[PDB]
Swiss-Prot record:
Residues 116-136 are annotated as: Disordered. The lineage of its organism: Bacteria, Bacillati, Bacillota, Bacilli, Bacillales. Ca(2+) binds at residues 16, 35-36. The active site is at residues 30, 38, 82. Residues 116-132 have a biased composition (Basic and acidic residues). It comes from the Bacteria. This is Nuclease A. It is found in: Secreted.
Length: 136
């Protein structure tokens, strides 16, 4: 069973990557299972809805009473040293909220880090039925 642990916002970097204070140390975190559009593409630059996803994550985190991190069952860090987790803002999962608003796609899934995959796919299917942002 996954467990939530408290964390403190240091800095939101973009739609799906953030800097948090976690167990006394600053760490970069990457949101599990979702891809938001990039604002820092060396390539494209700012992709479409990149700034939008970015403002959403930022506001949601910055306005929360409480932030919590939830590690999945698999690897907790990627090859870049980023924590891989589900982030909660006052009990609401940031990763689902982004997908529900059409501001992110569900990622390519890598077991066994896939516990909330179906939940997220359900939210993505609704944002697509409602044609929000990305799906519009």
């Amino acid at each position: 069973k996954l467990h939530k642990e408290p964390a403190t916002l240091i800095k939101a970097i973009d739609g799906d990557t953030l800097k948090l204070m976690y167990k006394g140390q600053p760490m970069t975190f990457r949101l599990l299972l979702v891809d938001t559009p990039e604002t820092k593409h060396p390539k494209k630059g700012v992709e479409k809805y990149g700034p939008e996803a970015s403002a959403f994550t930022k506001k949601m985190l910055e306005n929360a009473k409480k932030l919590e991190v939830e590690f999945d069952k698999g690897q907790r860090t990627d090859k870049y040293g980023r924590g891989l987790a589900y982030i909660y803002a006052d009990g609401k999962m940031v990763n689902e909220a982004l997908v529900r608003q059409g501001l992110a796609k569900v990622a390519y899934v890598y077991k066994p880090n896939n516990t909330h995959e179906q939940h997220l796919r359900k939210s993505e299917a609704q944002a697509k039925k409602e044609k929000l942002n990305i799906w519009s």
